[PDB]
């Protein structure tokens with residue numbers, strides 16, 4: 708339905724064929740479907756209608772919490788505990804959001820593999836490539852930090868990688 | 883439950899900031915005090931570690947029965 712964003716959770720246009728009977732025999736599946744409909748789906752729908760009638764009477768909402776952007780750990784001087792505290796809390800919240808991004812991408816991948824049936828190896832390549840890009844980025848940022856991770860250790864990992872990349876590019880320029 | 887038993891995150895956040903400031907000030911004060919004690923014990927110029935010497939008020943500055951003291 709419209710409850711969730713179809714841009715973050717997309718799906719193809721859902722092509723389904725029309726029934727083309729070839730025999731005089733009655734299809735027991737469709738009769739069972741009519742029986743199921745008129746014994747199960749209608750009482751359940753009525754119950755839900757009443758429940759939502761009672762819901763509409765008392766309507767209240769909640770709001771997603773928004774967080775400002777505070778200075779990160781790079782612009783905190785070495786022993787300033789308050790800047791360090793706020794930077795570390797911000798880094799932790801960002802780590803949580805990145806975990807959820809990888810989760811969304813993995814959900815897409817799984818849904819594609821199930822949906823595409825026998826053709827998943829070709830029809831889910833974009834989902835696989837998207838996951839590969841996200842996984843590579845997430846791995847660079849947080850892998851090998853260990854328990855007792857922190858923004859300072861993430862910064863040290865990034866700086867080590869940046870040094871290696873700079874030196875590699877410099878010796879490639881001499882080639 | 884949140885309304886009856888708990889508070890918002892800002893209270894715990896800023897209480898943590900206060901706690902952290904107190905603790906960090908105490909830590910730097912402890913280190914500085916150790917350094918001050920080291921210097922005062924090595925040099926003896928500070929108020930601390932003052933070892934008694936003889937009171938100059940005990941000396942008798944009167945003619946001493948011979949001219950050369």
Ligand SMILES: CCCCCCCCCCCCCCCCC[C@@H](O)O[C@H](CO[C@H](O)CCCCCCCCCCCCCCC)COP(=O)(O)OCC[N+](C)(C)C
Nearest residue numbers: 883884885886887888889890891892893894895896897898
């Ligand atoms: C609606 C029905 C379906 C859902 C049921 C919901 C289940 C909830 C009931 C379970 C009880 C919760 C356990 C109590 C733990 C909370 C303890 C503490 O955190 O609560 C204090 C608050 O005190 C509460 O009153 C807790 C007291 C609960 C004591 C339980 C005793 C029950 C024993 C049952 C005896 C019944 C009779 C016995 C006959 C012999 C908080 O202190 P406070 O300083 O405010 O903090 C500031 C927060 N402010 C700003 C919001 C005010």
